GROMACS .gro file of C-alpha atoms in nm:
model
  212
    1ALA     CA    1  -2.508  -0.848  -0.177
    2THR     CA    2  -2.715  -1.106  -0.396
    3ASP     CA    3  -2.436  -1.414  -0.260
    4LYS     CA    4  -2.067  -1.389  -0.181
    5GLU     CA    5  -1.994  -1.588  -0.523
    6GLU     CA    6  -2.230  -1.391  -0.723
    7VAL     CA    7  -2.047  -1.088  -0.695
    8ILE     CA    8  -1.754  -1.254  -0.701
    9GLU     CA    9  -1.849  -1.372  -1.091
   10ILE     CA   10  -1.949  -1.018  -1.143
   11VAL     CA   11  -1.599  -0.832  -1.094
   12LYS     CA   12  -1.453  -1.136  -1.328
   13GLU     CA   13  -1.692  -1.026  -1.578
   14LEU     CA   14  -1.545  -0.647  -1.537
   15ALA     CA   15  -1.218  -0.794  -1.484
   16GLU     CA   16  -1.253  -0.960  -1.814
   17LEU     CA   17  -1.399  -0.632  -2.001
   18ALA     CA   18  -1.119  -0.464  -1.869
   19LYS     CA   19  -0.862  -0.643  -2.028
   20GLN     CA   20  -1.071  -0.649  -2.392
   21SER     CA   21  -1.103  -0.279  -2.397
   22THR     CA   22  -0.853  -0.082  -2.591
   23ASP     CA   23  -0.989   0.292  -2.456
   24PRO     CA   24  -0.751   0.398  -2.140
   25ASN     CA   25  -1.054   0.595  -1.964
   26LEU     CA   26  -1.287   0.249  -1.948
   27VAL     CA   27  -1.002   0.044  -1.787
   28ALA     CA   28  -0.912   0.328  -1.566
   29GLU     CA   29  -1.298   0.293  -1.464
   30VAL     CA   30  -1.323  -0.074  -1.451
   31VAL     CA   31  -1.045  -0.062  -1.149
   32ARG     CA   32  -1.192   0.223  -0.971
   33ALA     CA   33  -1.511   0.052  -0.953
   34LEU     CA   34  -1.366  -0.262  -0.864
   35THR     CA   35  -1.159  -0.046  -0.592
   36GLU     CA   36  -1.471   0.094  -0.488
   37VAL     CA   37  -1.675  -0.274  -0.388
   38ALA     CA   38  -1.372  -0.343  -0.208
   39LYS     CA   39  -1.355  -0.030  -0.039
   40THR     CA   40  -1.720  -0.061   0.080
   41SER     CA   41  -1.737  -0.440   0.141
   42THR     CA   42  -1.674  -0.514   0.516
   43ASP     CA   43  -1.587  -0.906   0.390
   44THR     CA   44  -1.257  -0.958   0.405
   45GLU     CA   45  -1.216  -1.286   0.195
   46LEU     CA   46  -1.432  -1.089  -0.079
   47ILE     CA   47  -1.164  -0.798  -0.028
   48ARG     CA   48  -0.919  -1.057  -0.064
   49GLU     CA   49  -1.080  -1.264  -0.386
   50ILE     CA   50  -1.085  -0.889  -0.529
   51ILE     CA   51  -0.732  -0.825  -0.481
   52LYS     CA   52  -0.666  -1.134  -0.666
   53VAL     CA   53  -0.843  -1.020  -0.989
   54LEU     CA   54  -0.634  -0.723  -0.988
   55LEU     CA   55  -0.338  -0.898  -0.927
   56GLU     CA   56  -0.402  -1.112  -1.209
   57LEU     CA   57  -0.540  -0.787  -1.422
   58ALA     CA   58  -0.218  -0.591  -1.382
   59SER     CA   59  -0.030  -0.895  -1.542
   60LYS     CA   60  -0.267  -0.875  -1.840
   61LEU     CA   61  -0.284  -0.499  -1.915
   62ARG     CA   62  -0.100  -0.377  -2.204
   63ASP     CA   63  -0.106  -0.054  -2.145
   64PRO     CA   64   0.163   0.138  -1.879
   65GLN     CA   65  -0.116   0.363  -1.751
   66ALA     CA   66  -0.342   0.110  -1.709
   67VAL     CA   67  -0.064  -0.148  -1.517
   68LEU     CA   68   0.013   0.119  -1.248
   69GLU     CA   69  -0.309   0.236  -1.209
   70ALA     CA   70  -0.383  -0.159  -1.113
   71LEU     CA   71  -0.065  -0.164  -0.882
   72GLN     CA   72  -0.167   0.116  -0.727
   73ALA     CA   73  -0.521  -0.021  -0.656
   74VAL     CA   74  -0.347  -0.359  -0.529
   75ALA     CA   75  -0.147  -0.153  -0.298
   76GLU     CA   76  -0.447   0.041  -0.154
   77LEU     CA   77  -0.654  -0.225  -0.062
   78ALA     CA   78  -0.390  -0.458   0.022
   79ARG     CA   79  -0.308  -0.222   0.309
   80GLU     CA   80  -0.633  -0.196   0.378
   81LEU     CA   81  -0.680  -0.591   0.376
   82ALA     CA   82  -0.401  -0.583   0.622
   83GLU     CA   83  -0.558  -0.359   0.899
   84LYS     CA   84  -0.850  -0.530   0.870
   85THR     CA   85  -0.697  -0.884   0.942
   86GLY     CA   86  -0.431  -0.736   1.125
   87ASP     CA   87  -0.204  -0.970   0.908
   88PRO     CA   88   0.131  -0.865   0.891
   89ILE     CA   89   0.206  -1.039   0.515
   90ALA     CA   90  -0.083  -0.842   0.347
   91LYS     CA   91   0.136  -0.543   0.491
   92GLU     CA   92   0.444  -0.660   0.341
   93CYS     CA   93   0.257  -0.741  -0.003
   94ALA     CA   94   0.122  -0.383   0.007
   95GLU     CA   95   0.497  -0.259   0.066
   96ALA     CA   96   0.592  -0.490  -0.227
   97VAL     CA   97   0.362  -0.350  -0.481
   98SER     CA   98   0.436  -0.022  -0.410
   99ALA     CA   99   0.793  -0.090  -0.444
  100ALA     CA  100   0.745  -0.239  -0.779
  101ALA     CA  101   0.527  -0.003  -0.930
  102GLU     CA  102   0.754   0.275  -0.798
  103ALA     CA  103   1.040   0.116  -0.987
  104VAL     CA  104   0.849   0.031  -1.300
  105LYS     CA  105   0.777   0.397  -1.316
  106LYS     CA  106   1.136   0.523  -1.237
  107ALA     CA  107   1.245   0.269  -1.556
  108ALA     CA  108   1.004   0.354  -1.802
  109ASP     CA  109   1.040   0.722  -1.747
  110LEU     CA  110   1.424   0.694  -1.749
  111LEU     CA  111   1.376   0.514  -2.078
  112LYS     CA  112   1.161   0.748  -2.233
  113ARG     CA  113   1.479   1.017  -2.161
  114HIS     CA  114   1.718   0.770  -2.316
  115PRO     CA  115   1.549   0.540  -2.576
  116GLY     CA  116   1.892   0.403  -2.706
  117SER     CA  117   2.045   0.332  -2.374
  118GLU     CA  118   2.094  -0.045  -2.355
  119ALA     CA  119   2.116  -0.032  -1.966
  120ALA     CA  120   1.819   0.169  -1.962
  121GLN     CA  121   1.644  -0.068  -2.142
  122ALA     CA  122   1.778  -0.366  -1.936
  123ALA     CA  123   1.702  -0.168  -1.607
  124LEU     CA  124   1.329  -0.133  -1.745
  125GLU     CA  125   1.305  -0.535  -1.798
  126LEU     CA  126   1.420  -0.600  -1.420
  127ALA     CA  127   1.153  -0.377  -1.301
  128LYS     CA  128   0.912  -0.546  -1.514
  129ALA     CA  129   1.022  -0.873  -1.406
  130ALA     CA  130   1.091  -0.786  -1.049
  131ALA     CA  131   0.720  -0.654  -1.054
  132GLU     CA  132   0.586  -1.013  -1.178
  133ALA     CA  133   0.758  -1.165  -0.903
  134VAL     CA  134   0.579  -0.948  -0.644
  135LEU     CA  135   0.238  -1.046  -0.816
  136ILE     CA  136   0.275  -1.371  -0.772
  137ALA     CA  137   0.416  -1.369  -0.423
  138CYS     CA  138   0.125  -1.161  -0.313
  139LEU     CA  139  -0.116  -1.433  -0.467
  140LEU     CA  140   0.066  -1.693  -0.235
  141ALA     CA  141   0.044  -1.461   0.025
  142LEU     CA  142  -0.311  -1.383   0.031
  143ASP     CA  143  -0.366  -1.764  -0.033
  144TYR     CA  144  -0.171  -1.972   0.209
  145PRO     CA  145  -0.045  -1.678   0.464
  146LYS     CA  146   0.081  -1.917   0.703
  147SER     CA  147   0.320  -2.088   0.447
  148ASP     CA  148   0.673  -2.050   0.454
  149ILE     CA  149   0.703  -2.077   0.080
  150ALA     CA  150   0.464  -1.746   0.063
  151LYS     CA  151   0.703  -1.627   0.346
  152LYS     CA  152   1.031  -1.686   0.121
  153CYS     CA  153   0.867  -1.568  -0.215
  154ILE     CA  154   0.775  -1.274  -0.034
  155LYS     CA  155   1.112  -1.145   0.061
  156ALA     CA  156   1.261  -1.250  -0.254
  157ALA     CA  157   1.060  -1.060  -0.490
  158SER     CA  158   1.055  -0.780  -0.208
  159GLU     CA  159   1.387  -0.790  -0.261
  160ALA     CA  160   1.390  -0.777  -0.657
  161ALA     CA  161   1.196  -0.470  -0.615
  162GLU     CA  162   1.484  -0.308  -0.440
  163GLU     CA  163   1.713  -0.411  -0.684
  164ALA     CA  164   1.501  -0.289  -0.978
  165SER     CA  165   1.487   0.053  -0.783
  166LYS     CA  166   1.851   0.024  -0.784
  167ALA     CA  167   1.957  -0.062  -1.127
  168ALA     CA  168   1.737   0.247  -1.259
  169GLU     CA  169   1.927   0.457  -1.032
  170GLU     CA  170   2.269   0.364  -1.183
  171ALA     CA  171   2.092   0.355  -1.568
  172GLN     CA  172   2.022   0.680  -1.502
  173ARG     CA  173   2.404   0.743  -1.409
  174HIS     CA  174   2.606   0.542  -1.638
  175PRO     CA  175   2.356   0.502  -1.953
  176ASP     CA  176   2.663   0.411  -2.163
  177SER     CA  177   2.784   0.143  -1.929
  178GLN     CA  178   2.812  -0.208  -2.123
  179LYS     CA  179   2.884  -0.355  -1.734
  180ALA     CA  180   2.568  -0.185  -1.587
  181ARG     CA  181   2.385  -0.343  -1.852
  182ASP     CA  182   2.513  -0.682  -1.788
  183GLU     CA  183   2.489  -0.682  -1.413
  184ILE     CA  184   2.137  -0.543  -1.445
  185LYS     CA  185   2.078  -0.808  -1.684
  186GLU     CA  186   2.245  -1.091  -1.421
  187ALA     CA  187   2.015  -0.936  -1.164
  188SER     CA  188   1.707  -0.967  -1.404
  189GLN     CA  189   1.769  -1.366  -1.494
  190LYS     CA  190   1.770  -1.382  -1.079
  191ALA     CA  191   1.453  -1.228  -1.053
  192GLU     CA  192   1.312  -1.375  -1.341
  193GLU     CA  193   1.375  -1.768  -1.164
  194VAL     CA  194   1.253  -1.639  -0.823
  195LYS     CA  195   0.897  -1.525  -1.056
  196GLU     CA  196   0.892  -1.886  -1.212
  197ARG     CA  197   0.976  -2.101  -0.867
  198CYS     CA  198   0.686  -1.865  -0.702
  199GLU     CA  199   0.470  -1.988  -1.036
  200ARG     CA  200   0.526  -2.342  -1.004
  201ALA     CA  201   0.427  -2.350  -0.615
  202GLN     CA  202   0.079  -2.195  -0.647
  203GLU     CA  203  -0.233  -2.462  -0.655
  204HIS     CA  204  -0.504  -2.397  -0.953
  205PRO     CA  205  -0.834  -2.494  -0.986
  206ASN     CA  206  -0.886  -2.827  -1.148
  207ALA     CA  207  -1.204  -2.679  -1.324
  208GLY     CA  208  -1.136  -2.654  -1.683
  209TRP     CA  209  -1.295  -2.368  -1.903
  210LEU     CA  210  -1.546  -2.593  -2.044
  211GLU     CA  211  -1.726  -2.740  -1.703
  212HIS     CA  212  -1.747  -2.344  -1.631
   0.00000   0.00000   0.00000
């Protein structure tokens, strides 16, 4: 623990390095390593910050296995962070992430079985959009746990995760239904708007790449 900011700078190098690698084993190690630090740290703000790095990483990983691995880790640390801080939102975020990962896993599994089912393609898109909404909503929940914006965007993003799971259920039953495709796509647009509305609410640091 040379310094709280130092370790924070360390994980970012690991996070950025995780995105650059094209080998799945090395990425899984980065998650496990990032998960170990937070699992051993007694500094909630350090844990909180590490989760934020994991949220952004899941957004940028291009391997489905690595994404789910990132979402699982976020769920784990978020649940631990909620118990420590006794903060309910951290629990809410943890549940929403798990709901999001599950729908993604369900939809991706289905599409593999019916690669030509447009309704199945629509279901995966909804699960992806729902997941992104959860990621952005968790980021607000962690930064502004007291804000009502975070309360609303977590409730909506959580809602999108339940719909994403229901869409995968109907799609499996009716892989050949155009109506089911249209409904899922309609629900997908709503979830995408949630993500965009919540993203606009977050405040980023006025620190350009060149300054740091």
